[PDB]
Design a binder for this molecule. Structure first.
Ligand SMILES: NC(=O)c1ccc[n+]([C@@H]2O[C@H](COP(=O)([O-])OP(=O)(O)OC[C@H]3O[C@@H](n4cnc5c(N)ncnc54)[C@H](O)[C@@H]3O)[C@@H](O)[C@H]2O)c1
Ligand SMILES: NC(=O)c1ccc[n+]([C@@H]2O[C@H](COP(=O)([O-])OP(=O)(O)OC[C@H]3O[C@@H](n4cnc5c(N)ncnc54)[C@H](O)[C@@H]3O)[C@@H](O)[C@H]2O)c1
Ligand SMILES: NC(=O)c1ccc[n+]([C@@H]2O[C@H](COP(=O)([O-])OP(=O)(O)OC[C@H]3O[C@@H](n4cnc5c(N)ncnc54)[C@H](O)[C@@H]3O)[C@@H](O)[C@H]2O)c1
Ligand SMILES: NC(=O)c1ccc[n+]([C@@H]2O[C@H](COP(=O)([O-])OP(=O)(O)OC[C@H]3O[C@@H](n4cnc5c(N)ncnc54)[C@H](O)[C@@H]3O)[C@@H](O)[C@H]2O)c1
Ligand SMILES: Oc1cc(CC2CCCCC2)ccc1Oc1ccc(Cl)cc1Cl
Ligand SMILES: Oc1cc(CC2CCCCC2)ccc1Oc1ccc(Cl)cc1Cl
Ligand SMILES: Oc1cc(CC2CCCCC2)ccc1Oc1ccc(Cl)cc1Cl
Ligand SMILES: Oc1cc(CC2CCCCC2)ccc1Oc1ccc(Cl)cc1Cl
Lengths: 268, 268, 268, 268
């Protein structure tokens, strides 16, 4: 077995054990992948979490806003996996939007400096990670990023929706570059998952008419999904990412795969 | 290994060894599935083909327009796999449209009797196969059908485009029914594959301004696809179907997966 | 004034004064169009209704399933508008699906004979009306049909959803034919309107878990729509149809215009 | 007559007489609107152009990156139209992306500082113009912006595609805000028009494999469009904008109208 046997895969975005990236890494290891991880601010905090993965993995620092971190990334990764070895997979599982761009802050009140930052981290860095890492990927490789369907507007998500729309567009252009390396680029559009990131905005709208809206949005998902949706279980999305990292979707690129219980295909 | 180890899967639509269903069956067997096959008119012709699959499989007759064939299908399948065993997978890989509905026949000149027949076989039968077989599927099961992206109009495809639009809609409703059984329903939208079905219409427009259009359509696909597209190689699509039949896309239903080299994501 | 001054427009689909076609005709007359109407079974019933339009209009019989009615249509229309005059506009505002294909009947229990009939009337007849009438339309003309967004599945709508998916596809192919005449073809996807057609299925699910679902669907529309939605007011949709019949959307064809309060652009 | 009789409409984005905004203003005046215009850097250059409009209009300076220009805009507009008068329409017809984000510059080589600037001007400013001007719009009003379908990737357009994807998302959120004022927000997705903006990138890829790609893209548009497409004629798009500014699409918001000859609805 091992869906990902022999594959070398870089996984960004682990912060806690609820992190989507955490379960992607876990399942990938269960499936025989050898991992390199990146983490952002609290590397020692991140290391404690990554120590509970089924296997050891080098953990490197990557602030996606940091051009020195980006400039050095490929060298550092090759140091980690061994000269003459290349990556077969890359997982981008990172996002951020300042508080003004989400939750209860009026949409019109977000200053562009804040929006711009969120777009830098959530959308542009998909291209910047691909730039850094494509020169060290094997033909038949796979880059995957995380998306939340922004094709319709909704409460609370606000400027992050705009950043995910940008990301979808970025992914299509990354695919054009990656194809030259024989590499695929896709997003997985996940349904809601109880993660540190959304506890943030769920917590940010406690007394408020955005918290109630978010609750309604969540309940509608499991209702719409023909197979249901369990926000407490990240593994169906981790498995989907691993599917795209495997050799089993070899003809799919510039694309989006919906791991959302089928909710997006149903009006109600 | 065996992506589909232990799974029992019914595969319809084999007619020659170029058949998409043929390569789906082949790869599924290579991955440890145990198959039941159905074939339509020339069962002895179909048997010769299915004898070159890596393993033996019961082959049953199914004319999807035949209510007796449909009424008896589940009993016949259970006879084939053994009382107390159920299906984990179903592949619908069938289509037909009379000559008036495609190629060089003017779009307006197709009589509804012909269109209706093509829709019966290409779209409605997805629901009729699901009706027959869901009562004999295991939770966690997967129904897959074959699609050709009908979201834009194009030369030659004509009324089959309409039938695939109907199919996409049917699939979303099948997913609502299948979810009750814990079963997924999805389509794979494939790029063009050199199959008996399209040699038919490719052959039908030899001297004509539909044959040239078809040639242009085919060349544009490999051009648009960031990873290219090889119309002579059905296995990337077979692998995609097997991915959906596996446990690795467990959160995806009522949906369409594009196995088209990423062509649909690129304008040019 | 007169948005449609001097234009000759055929309007099908009037049955009562709640009919979408009724308000399309009314607004068109208010805007200076000269109309020809078609009606289906109860022509004397239809005549009583059409007598309350602001102006007189010839009313002709057209059963869209009747090849003699279709074969004779263009001659009959030209008789009505005068030799040497041609149509500038055509409104298709017709649909039907037998009771088995909607409401509370299980999706799987609709026989294809019933589905086929609904598709004939709701989707195929768009092409058959275009075939009949394009040879009598002026360059710069406009064909419009009525749609209900079938891009997602939903309760109760069932097989009519499939028929509207087919229609969307038909419209794209009609546009290819109409372009040769300098004629546009588009659909207007309306939000729900209290019409005879949906009182039918609203009435059909009185005690039932499809009636409640329909109520929920309706309430969500006005909730989702940024400008709200009033199911009791057909005129915003009539005005939209007239916009497409006018010279003010001259570059739009094979397309769908959403007159739905913007509901389709919002998740909630 | 006068489709826009009595309406007060602000039109941004005039730079030359080939400007889409120029023809929008012109047609709007021909239809009885009273205009206020805004212009960006070369106000005296812009004034020469705007002097050839059918009627006089106040012209104000607006650099959409300038928070003082934005903060003062509504006061300045009301000064221009008269205390106690409000706007019925707003046209956003502005975009910019630095040279690194388009044409022949590799996609990966655009620094975020450049991308961020283009997104600020092309996408974010749609929200910032709505913020400024909604407090001075009448119920039943209309905000329109200009889009180029970014749903698929393509040569040369590069990071502007990403900025238009963001814009589409912004528009859906603007619609949620505007609905509170009884105001509609929509985009018009135009086919290619020979304008100063694209002569820029057409000129930027003279000897190069992006210039040839752009030529191919342009030729395919008129080929795909069932009614053809004339890149030299901006008026079909101006008329479409005026349609959305009128009372004739009263139920359409958060939406995109395609004024592209129907090219987007056809594969080829
Ligand atoms: N949780 C959900 O319901 C959900 C649904 C769909 C998509 N997503 C997406 O999944 C991805 C992962 O988020 P999550 O929900 O697992 O939340 P999370 O908090 O677990 O992960 C977000 C990660 O982004 C990282 N990050 C922030 N700024 C960074 C930067 N400057 N450089 C490098 N890393 C940075 C954080 O350190 C964190 O590890 C995000 O793109 C999110 O938008 C989440
Ligand atoms: N080949 C392509 O380029 C391509 C691309 C996308 C999608 N598809 C779809 O893939 C599917 C398989 O087609 P293929 O290209 O492998 O061609 P094929 O000729 O190999 O397969 C078509 C099958 O449909 C069966 N069939 C016809 N009428 C039937 C009926 N009454 N009952 C039961 N079976 C019936 C035929 O017997 C044949 O086995 C079709 O749905 C087709 O529309 C094909
Ligand atoms: N009412 C809504 O909420 C709504 C929403 C979106 C789209 N639509 C669509 O609008 C169109 C008009 O329907 P309506 O809601 O105004 O209902 P309606 O009952 O007023 O109109 C339906 C019309 O179809 C005609 N018809 C049925 N079979 C025919 C045939 N054999 N030949 C010719 N005409 C035939 C009927 O005579 C009737 O005039 C339909 O296509 C419907 O699907 C309705
Ligand atoms: N021309 C086309 O083929 C085409 C197709 C689809 C969409 N569009 C869109 O139409 C809109 C108008 O562009 P055009 O093609 O008429 O080109 P144009 O050069 O005529 O117009 C662009 C305008 O944007 C203005 N602008 C730039 N930065 C600004 C800022 N800081 N503040 C205020 N204004 C600023 C310029 O002054 C200019 O007036 C753009 O959004 C463009 O993306 C153009
Ligand atoms: O992209 C996401 C999407 C969701 C689902 C969701 C459904 C409830 C309406 C709101 C959002 C949850 C979390 C998401 O990630 C982030 C969100 C904010 C920041 Cl700051 C960082 C990250 Cl990583
Ligand atoms: O659905 C299909 C799609 C294609 C690809 C293609 C691209 C060239 C423009 C035309 C079609 C090829 C074959 C397809 O299957 C059938 C087609 C006709 C009949 Cl009668 C039966 C079947 Cl199964
Ligand atoms: O196409 C339609 C769509 C709707 C809106 C709606 C929203 C409530 C869920 C259900 C449907 C209402 C009426 C519609 O027309 C018809 C419906 C049935 C027949 Cl038999 C004939 C016609 Cl014309
Ligand atoms: O948004 C646009 C779209 C197009 C059509 C087109 C088709 C040929 C492939 C390329 C682009 C032309 C011009 C466009 O406007 C701008 C472009 C650049 C700048 Cl810097 C500013 C503006 Cl306003």
């Amino acid at each position: 077995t091992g869906l990902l046997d022999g594959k070398r895969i870089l996984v960004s975005g682990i912060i806690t054990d609820s992190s989507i990236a955490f379960h992607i890494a876990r399942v990938a290891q269960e499936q025989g992948a050898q991992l390199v991880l990146t983490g952002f601010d609290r590397l020692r905090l991140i290391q404690r979490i990554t120590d509970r993965l089924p296997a050891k993995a080098p953990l490197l620092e990557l602030d996606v806003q940091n051009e020195e971190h980006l400039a050095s990334l490929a060298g550092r990764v090759t140091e980690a996996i061994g000269a003459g070895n290349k990556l077969d997979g890359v997982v981008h599982s990172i996002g951020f939007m300042p508080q003004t761009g989400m939750g209860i802050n009026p949409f019109f009140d977000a200053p562009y400096a804040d929006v711009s930052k969120g777009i830098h981290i959530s959308a542009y860095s998909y291209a910047s990670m691909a730039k850094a890492l494509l020169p060290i990927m094997n033909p038949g490789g796979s880059i995957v990023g995380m998306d939340f369907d922004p094709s319709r507007a909704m409460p609370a998500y606000n400027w992050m929706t705009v950043a995910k729309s940008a990301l979808e567009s970025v992914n299509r252009f990354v695919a054009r570059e990656a194809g030259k390396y024989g590499v695929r680029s896709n997003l997985v559009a996940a349904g809601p998952i109880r993660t540190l990131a959304m506890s943030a905005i769920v917590g940010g709208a406690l007394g408020e008419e955005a918290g109630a809206q978010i609750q309604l949005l969540e309940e509608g998902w499991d209702q719409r999904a023909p197979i249901g949706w369990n926000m407490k279980d990240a593994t169906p999305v981790a498995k989907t990412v691993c599917a795209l990292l495997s050799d089993w979707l070899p003809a799919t690129t510039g694309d989006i795969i919906y791991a959302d219980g089928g909710a997006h295909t149903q009006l109600l």
